Amino acid sequence: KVFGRCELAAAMKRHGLDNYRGYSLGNWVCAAKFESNFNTQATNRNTDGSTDYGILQINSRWWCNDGRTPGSRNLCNIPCSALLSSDITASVNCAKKIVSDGNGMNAWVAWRNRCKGTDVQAWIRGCRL
Ligand SMILES: [Cl-]
Ligand SMILES: [Cl-]
Ligand SMILES: [Cl-]
Ligand SMILES: [Cl-]
Ligand SMILES: [Cl-]
Ligand SMILES: [Cl-]
Ligand SMILES: [Cl-]
Ligand code: NA
16 A cells, blocks of 8 residues: 555554654654655665565664564564555554664664754644544
């Protein structure tokens, strides 16, 4: 599914991401924009053989099982396929674990490089929330 900007802001708020670990909703919308362009079916293969899945491009080295990332973990206890669903529940619940890991949203390199310290409230401007 390709979400609209405000549609995704709403879904993320519905699932308790807004101000989760102190990160405002605009930070999460911005991260999703640059990770996936709001496409739940986004995938990206890394040089190490791991794969990133879904609207927040969650990686198979730690967070989900895809059966093809040797030595990896599955700390979200889900198949990586769950991260490609039109229903963002699995992505949001797994993102809550990731952002709790110690480095906050710096775990998403695209957030650090493209969203951190910018006027992220622009990402929810106009939205009925
Ligand atoms: Cl947009
Ligand atoms: Cl915000
Ligand atoms: Cl594996
Ligand atoms: Cl595990
Ligand atoms: Cl599995
Ligand atoms: Cl949803
Ligand atoms: Cl933090
Ligand atoms: Na894994």
